[model samples]
Target chain A: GSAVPFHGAHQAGIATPVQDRLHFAAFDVTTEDRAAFVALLKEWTAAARRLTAGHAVGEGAYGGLPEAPPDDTGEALGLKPSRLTLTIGFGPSLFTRFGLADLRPEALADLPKFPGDNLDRARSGGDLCVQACADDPQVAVHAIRNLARIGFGKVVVRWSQLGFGKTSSTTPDKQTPRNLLGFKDGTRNIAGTEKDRLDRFVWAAEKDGTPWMTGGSYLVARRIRMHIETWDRASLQEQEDVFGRDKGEGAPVGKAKERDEPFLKAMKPDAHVRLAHPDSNGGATLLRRGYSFTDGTDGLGRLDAGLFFLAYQRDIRTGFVPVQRNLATDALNEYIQHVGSAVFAVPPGVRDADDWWGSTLF
Target chain B: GSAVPFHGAHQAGIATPVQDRLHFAAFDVTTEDRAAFVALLKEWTAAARRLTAGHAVGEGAYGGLPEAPPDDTGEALGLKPSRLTLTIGFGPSLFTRFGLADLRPEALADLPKFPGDNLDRARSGGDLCVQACADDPQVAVHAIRNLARIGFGKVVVRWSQLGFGKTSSTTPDKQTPRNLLGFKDGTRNIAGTEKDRLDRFVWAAEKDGTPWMTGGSYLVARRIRMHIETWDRASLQEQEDVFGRDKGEGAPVGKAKERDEPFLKAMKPDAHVRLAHPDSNGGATLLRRGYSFTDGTDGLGRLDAGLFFLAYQRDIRTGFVPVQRNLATDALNEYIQHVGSAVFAVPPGVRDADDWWGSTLFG
Candidate 1:
């Protein structure tokens, strides 16, 4: 609908520096023999894992089809995992190994987003699949090992799932879950048209990324902690003030100024004390998608600070940081702190073509 | 050419738990404000996670999906995380939530994998979605609380990665991995054929499970450890002897067996010995979608163990287990151990009916 790199799969790119110390490393390797490669990978994984136990080193792979697949032997194979995972897709071909190179803003002109307020959209999507017990770290780890050992080049790793998000509830006669949040979130996010999706998640580019990586993209992972109790104690008016809208009515401070939509632009002339007032200086925004993790109610009731927020964007300055800078002075900052932070320059998706993230810089 | 799902932007059951122990669930919790439903869900999730985490409760959800779907509005309006992943989904009506109930297999005598397998087959599918992170469990909790605040069911999680199979390579540059015994793997499995799929993954009236979950299915998770050091240390002859074939010719134990395909079945009439006998088990015959992992190598000094052997079957009793049991006593067993195991009964997929996972037993 909208012309640009769309981000339909709900993805973005962004990162931040950590004030505290953290150990990390990213690798790009290749191998052959699904069996033997796996053998070697086991060794490397153990070494990395020993440094961080109870932490999942997940594994994932991308199996694909030939331009045109072959004949049907008439077996009900159902849907088998890709015969050729990205792990098996290693070796010298920089393109096959690393996948995509840079995920620059200019290259994201084609990604797409669903629609409506992100809050509403997330609410609606919660019903489909929120089966918790995440073994992702391990999933991520094993996936990488296999690929790295097999012959796949371009492998990257990072510390993740700093918290937890896994669950399955068959409470017979009870209800089902939607999201980490208790509310029915994002019910209003589905787009009415292609143009809508373009504006929310996608960037504006006729086509983006490299030739082989066209329509492909990079994912961003950001994490911020919030003070739930501190947030809950505030009056409805105070809540809306920080978020820039009455908690109930759900609108920005410049509400009704523009008869049509709930405005979040610069606080209009008659704004009510500029609810979304310039935190520090001006407002800054970041596309967020951080999963909430309860480190357990601060055992003594002090309320352990949960994830304040996390999201993605093509650019940090324009996407998340700047808005965060604005919030620095906004009321929300009082209940939250920029405790832990990280950034991962996710490679373009499976279909992209590059030397598995082979950039001169890395 | 192989008409086995995954054609267009959709799939027949592409999300089908490959050879691994993969399973999904569909909870019933619908509400007005999607957020409220997700919030209660946060409470439930925390509870479920408790079992796997510290002390308390039940098993939890396997995996998760995002809320935002890539689209134009996201880019144009500048939505964060673009498609705010809000809910989960079964398939669409024609293909999703439908339980294939009243439509008796008796009516369509020529059904694919009917009765047991077919019924269970229908149960196999589910609508999957997730609530995007709002930095508040209450955000996820409120949505999960009220009656309408629910609709999505839980996803039972049995997992497996497409392990290093016969053609399964780690690095993109090479071809096929060696088996624990050091020989190239994947010499026999079928590579997507119309016949193979029908015969293996699907079933009919006299097919698999029972009436309760007709199209539903049973998933298996097997942990077959490979003794890498022991196998790696063997000679060509020793390796051939154990696998029951000459390392070079890849033939069975005797001279008269001059066939291209390894003579595994012919080596031992007992089946068990032949499957793993030093001079029997020939070429590859299993459909392996294995993954490599670090289980912290044992004291044996082997860098790795066996493959995460994952193979699906119409009947585990006859299909994989038998083959494995036979291989259990084979020379291969000496190197590995069956450390972990689990079997999950995956319901048939539901087409888009009124209820998301509102079929039989679940209903």
Candidate 2:
């Protein structure tokens, strides 16, 4: 029941049910040969197709060619599919090489620097990205491990995040999960069942900018590091005030229910939920698919933990720009630092049985 | 159903059902007051009792004082107990201070530097440590998070590792699990039910050393960093030859079943299992309870992934030392580096209803 259809009109991960585990990687493509790069994507597509169906890489790791490297890392040998979905994306940097400039979408641009963003060069930007989600951490890891193995010399992992429990869900029926800050996040996310909302805010129109980007979406990835030690000491009232929502009920300011229309005027001018609200930004809704992460202590005494914020939208200029600009003065800024950033042009999904990822762009 | 008995003759983590995730921490004591340290320990014990029973601290997270920080972090809310267990240990550095030198067991001395070791100073030693295990990673993280919060002024976390999936099990009924190396590890581990073997090889005897260690055990922790990029390139035959086991079946070189006796004569002189086996090192057997860890990338171009190897024994001199000495020239050394190591005296478990983790020693 958890298995998602591999081939569809749109990629599975964006609109698919959020899984409990995530192994996301941004790779630096080193291969200069166009044929080699394309071949790797084809191979990854086939492998991901098999893995999502609850099968192994080549023939199964154990019974593969006795002499060859195991097709799949055997750690996820007996695990179920658990609604695993692997979504691929191409970054702006990938266009400069491999004769990809003509195919690059006009909307695919590097994210603009926001207020209080102390982005680490090593953690930001990549040529390619893959977001792997599954109910089991080992299964998600196994998926990335096999793909990375298959891509041996062609690409190297620039940065990766191992995220537990999702911070957001795409469907309205699913409960809004909490972020590391203990506040229910993504309470007003774009519901997957709303085809009208999906068409207006999520799916890129075929005639919008680039033909290759039709039905595809743009991704905004940010590793938001929460200053938990400071936030932990703040009073409960202050914590709730920072987000402009009731901590216990996740209701918007002056609202009694979570689904009630947010009273933006009643919220503090700097409130995060108010500033980032669609009504405040003249209608900018994003499909929030974030996850929480704790990557050990930060050399300093404080814990390096926060939300790995991810969003998908039809166009960045309309979707994230206005909302982020409005949040430049958000009250949550004092507690979080955007340490990592990346944006990728996710080409339309492989609609046919024989097609691979980026088949349209190629 | 997920609850494990918190009060027992022995600590739960060692023989408790293996959990899917772990959040282990080693803390350095900052305070000089023995009274403060003991008080924090008592607070931690009570908190652990409640948490293992699937309850929150001090009237729960919500509906508390509107002006104060929540008693427990709310991340583990609505989650099962997940059979959470918290095990405690005292380090040799702890004995140097606090006038506890006399209570330190001989088996609790610091581990010697093994061959090809590259231990990091920050990760190698601690004044005290806690092992938190639970089926849910969030549950385990919550347990450690609350304990660290409780000991804010008295102690600070020196280092911590978030591990996924148990690599070994001490119970006989559980199936053998694989490590990051993708091999069935600890196939010959000491079963928890083997009382005779446990007494002979695991539990430290009162007559053997300090009386405080009568029913206690010794713990050896090693952060073994596996050179995955190098291993990923090795041929299948070479990988199998290095471990002296079938990569697929996990059997000895000439054996069919995983539990079959190994024909050492048929293995290469430098095979890992052959060198670490009891037959090769004065009959040393360890109750291994290790886990796999992947802490992002190594800053270079590879992943910082490997095994967080844990072993328990009656004494170190006759256990880890000799077998590690025999493995000084093992073939697997080419792909693994010991980056962190620590040894601790795990005091006897609480006996009575009123007894705490180290009640006898404190008394």
TM-score of each: 0.35, 0.95
lDDT of 1 by residue, A175-210 (tens): 222223111122222122434433444232224333
Model 1 chain B worst lDDT run, 10 consecutive residues = B70-79
* Residue range B290-326, candidate 2, lDDT tens digits: 8888877756658888999888999988888888889
Residue-level lDDT tens digits of model 1 in B258-317 = 245555554644333366332332322334444443332223222333555444344444
| TM-score of the B chain in each candidate versus the native B chain | 0.47, 0.96
Model 2, span A12-83: residue lDDT tens? 899887887888999998889999988998999999889898788886666555577666667665556778
Model 2 misplaced stretches (Cα beyond 4 Å): A63-67, A253-261, B166-174, B351-353
The CAPRI classification for model 1 reads as incorrect
lDDT of each: 0.31, 0.83
Instruction: Report how far residue A50 has shifted in candidate 2, in Å.
Output: 2.1
